[PDB]
Amino acid sequence: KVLPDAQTVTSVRHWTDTLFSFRVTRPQTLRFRSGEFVMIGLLDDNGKPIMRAYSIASPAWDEELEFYSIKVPDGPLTSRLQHIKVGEQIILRPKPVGTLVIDALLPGKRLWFLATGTGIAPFASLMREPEAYEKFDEVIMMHACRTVAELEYGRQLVEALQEDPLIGELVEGKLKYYPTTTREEFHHMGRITDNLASGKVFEDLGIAPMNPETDRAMVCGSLAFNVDVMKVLESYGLREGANSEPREFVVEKAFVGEGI
Ligand SMILES: Cc1cc2nc3c(=O)[nH]c(=O)nc-3n(C[C@H](O)[C@H](O)[C@H](O)COP(=O)(O)OP(=O)(O)OC[C@H]3O[C@@H](n4cnc5c(N)ncnc54)[C@H](O)[C@@H]3O)c2cc1C
Ligand SMILES: NC(=O)c1ccc[n+]([C@@H]2O[C@H](COP(=O)([O-])OP(=O)(O)OC[C@H]3O[C@@H](n4cnc5c(N)ncnc54)[C@H](OP(=O)(O)O)[C@@H]3O)[C@@H](O)[C@H]2O)c1
Ligand SMILES: CCCCCCCS[C@@H]1O[C@H](CO)[C@@H](O)[C@H](O)[C@H]1O
Secondary structure, eight states, X not given: OOOTTEEEEEEEEEOSSSEEEEEEEOOTTOOOOXXXXXXXXXXXXXXXXXXXXXXXXXXXXXSEEEEEEEOOTTOTTHHHHTTOOTTOEEXXXXXXXXXXXXXXXXOOSEEEEEEEGGGGHHHHHHTTOGGGGTSOSEEEEEEEESSSTTTHHHXXXXXXXXXXXXXXXXSTTTEEEEEEESSSOOSSBSOHHHHHHSOHHHHHHTOOOOOSSSOOEEEEEOHHHXXXXXXXXXXXXXXXXXSSSOOSEEEEXXXXXXXX
C-alpha cells in the first residue's frame, strides 16, 4: 500500500526545541512561484491524514523542497512531524496557492519582507528567488523574533547567501537583512511595526522612509502582526491587494491562532 502524494524526507535540521527545518523530494508534478504554500501532513493513530498549510521555504528553481516548521507539543501535526527522519515520508498536496507572490506586486525599487517567527519561511524562498532581484532593485528582510536562537535558521540562510563565492556579492548591495529580537539582547532590537513607525529601520539602513512611491512589501506574521503592520504601512500610504492585480502590498497569516 502506497501513500497518495507522498514525498520522501532527504534531511532534517533542528534549530531549537520548537523550530526545525527539513527538505523533501519534489513531486514531479509541482510547478510553483516562490512564496506560495501547500498542504503537508502525517497519519494519526487510526490512519487519518492530518493536513496543514506550509510555506515552501526553498525557491521555485530548487529541485528539492524545504520546509521551516514550528514544533507545538499537543500539536496534532507538528507533535508528530517533529520526529520525521530521513527516509520517512510525508503527504504533500502539490496545489500551490498564496498571496505572497511577486506578481501580486508590480512596482520596482523596493520589496520589503516583514515577518516574525516561522513567518520567515516564505521569504527564505523569495530571498532566493531571482525574480525578486530583477523586478526589484533592493530587498529588505525584516525578521523579528523573541530570542536570538529563533533568528538562526534565517541568519545562517542569509550568511550563506552573502558568503557564497559567486551568488554572494551578487546579492551584494541588493539584499539587506534586518534581524531583531524583542526579548533577548541583540545589537538591533525592537518590533517591526515600531521600528518602521519610529523610523529606526530607516536611519539604521541609511535609507528613505518607506513611501508608497513604487515601494512594496509582503507581510507574514500572526493576525495581530498583520493588521498592526498593514496599518503602519498605509500610515505611509501602501494598499493591500493580492494574486494577479496591481497593488502596494500583500499579507498572509504565518499561522492561525494566537501563537506559542
Ligand atoms: C497560510 C499559512 C501558512 C503557514 N505556514 C507555516 C509554515 O511555514 N511553518 C509552520 O510551522 N507553520 C505554518 N503555518 C501554521 C500551520 O499551518 C500549522 O498550524 C502548524 O503546522 C502547527 O500545526 P499543529 O497541528 O501541530 O498545531 P495547530 O493545531 O495547528 O495549532 C496549535 C497552536 O499552535 C500555534 N501555532 C501553530 N503554528 C504556529 C507557528 N508556525 N508559529 C507560532 N505558533 C504556531 C497556534 O497558537 C495554534 O493555535 C501556516 C499557516 C497558514 C494559515
Ligand atoms: N507576562 C507573561 O506571564 C506572559 C507574556 C507573554 C506570553 N505569555 C505566555 O506566552 C503566550 C504567547 O506569547 P509569546 O511568547 O508568543 O509572545 P508574542 O507576542 O506572541 O511574540 C511573538 C513575536 O511577535 C511580536 N509581536 C506581537 N504582537 C505584535 C504586533 N502587534 N506588532 C509587531 N510585532 C508583534 C512580539 O514582539 P514583543 O516581544 O515586543 O511582544 C514577538 O517578537 C501567551 O499565551 C502566554 O500564555 C506570558
Ligand atoms: C537568470 C538568472 C540566474 C541566476 C542564478 C540563480 C541560482 S541557480 C543555482 O545555484 C546554485 C549555486 O550554489 C547551484 O548549486 C544550483 O545547481 C543552481 O541551480
